[model samples]
Target: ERIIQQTDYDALSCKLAAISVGYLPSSGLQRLSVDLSKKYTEWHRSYLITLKKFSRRAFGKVDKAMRSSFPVMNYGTYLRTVGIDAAILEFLVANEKVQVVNLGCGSDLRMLPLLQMFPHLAYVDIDYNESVELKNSILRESEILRISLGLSKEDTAKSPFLIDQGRYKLAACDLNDITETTRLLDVCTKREIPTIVISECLLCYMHNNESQLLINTIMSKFSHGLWISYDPIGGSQPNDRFGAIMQSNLKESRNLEMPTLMTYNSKEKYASRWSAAPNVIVNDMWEIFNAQIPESERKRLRSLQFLDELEELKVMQTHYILMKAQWH
Candidate 1:
């Protein structure tokens, strides 16, 4: 459990890193990470004296990601985060009412900014139980985090960890448990209106059949829906080497196995999973940067850092994808 759970910290740290680099604006992220770090330190201060309830080892794991990150990581983090947001924004504009469920949503609070824009959006965040508890505690402790959710001292708790008059629900469930996943989502959303299920670097962790089961079950549940996902892929060409090196590193360093990265090794292969959908589109990060991201925005990003790596960036970006599948 600690092994897989570590990925959340990895992802959250990347976002935290990107935020500091100005790729993302902070929306209670500083408070969240700082609080955790503070608690972690406090635990150590008290650890030598007594047996502690908190796992000091788990606390140690967080600090590792917090230490520092490379510029390439920050760049990729920025693109993936914005790519997902841009898709969500477009969908929100097209639909009158929508329910969005983020699968394995780490410590990401992108929903905060979204709710500020779309007050009526029913947003559900589903992740590990511990992650849910941590987020709930943070939201409970700070009013600033609650402000975007249309909450106030005046609002009542419509349900546990659900605010914005129950439009926002922070749920806890092992996503592999389809029954639990369905039950939790049913309470927070409905089959009517459009439902959007988003997975950010999430599906890659599961087996191909498991991920397919997740998508098919959720897709069939909603009348109108969209599935947005971002994940890495092995290169399409047989001789290509980046993905193989990436696979080895993940395995050797963390025992992480991203089978789908190799299985759906190209954009066409990635899109094939959603063949039943009315519209399915997949673009590599490079394609998204070239075609979707505006030149004005691109120029601003270029000014942020001294990166003499357009070639390297393209190679890295081409190995990852942003995919959207829509169905009526």
Candidate 2:
């Protein structure tokens, strides 16, 4: 049932952990993430409570679910989340009116702040039904979220799970299901204006053919747009242990598969899928960290968490990348 989506909650744990450690400031639905995380903790506890049995293994799993990820993970989370925004802002600067689509978005609230800031911007978030349902439940409880979405009373009354606000719409879709994907998105976006599609860590979930097919199928709707994706690069070198270890841990611990991990193991190979794009840009997090993050910010981060191993961080960052593919 919801086993695969358990990844979202685990990710939220990392995100909430990163937030508490001050990697990202308290802004833009940060509190809501905290709120949802607590709710998730309660939900997991309630599952155990119903069994009427307490064991060390089961109880211990609960705490680890909400535990702080390491400094490396925190730094990556900070950079990835912020870098997407940086890309979005750059896209907005280049075009007058733009639409943003977040595919396989797992309760990410990045759209809220930007939608409020840009008058001509519209955002569409598509996720599996479970994620959208949980997000809807949280939104129903947050009046501020409703206000931020510019939802009228009618909008709120339409459906408990439906969020069709003026500038923002949240819906459910299986990204690999091309028919379902188009049907859901066709109504949400005009597809004439410039669009930005973001998939922070979504593509790695699908097999190479499905991922590439989804890309080909989805891009046909937009005359001009950009796709920004962030994913781990399974290191291309035979000696690289980072990618293999990461792959092993994910599969063994979570039963999650990264089908395209090796297929898109390097920057050149990763961008190979988007060859249709006229302008395809890819940068590992190390390049992004050095080129985009200024010294003052790194100093500020070090002050917060005391990251001593710059070399370690760079090596770790090289395994992950933020890529942008644009069609003219």
- Tell me, by lDDT, which candidate is best: 2
Off by more than 4 A, model 2: 26-67, 151-161
What's the TM-score of each model vs. the native? 0.84, 0.85
Tens digits of lDDT, candidate 2, 1-328: 3555656665665666666677774233232255544443343234333212423543355347546477877887878876777788888877969988898777576676566557899888888887776666555445455455666434363432378767778887877788888788778887688999998788888888778888997777889989999888888878888777887988888788887887678988998888888899999988988888777777777877767687898888899898899996
- Where does candidate 1 stray beyond 4 Å? 26-67, 150-165
lDDT of each: 0.72, 0.73
List the pairs of residues colliding in candidate 2.
Answer: none
TM-score of 1: 0.84
Tell me how many residue pairs clash in candidate 2. Answer: 0
lDDT of 1 by residue, 234-312 (tens): 9998799877898899899999888888889999999898888979988999888788767766776677776678889
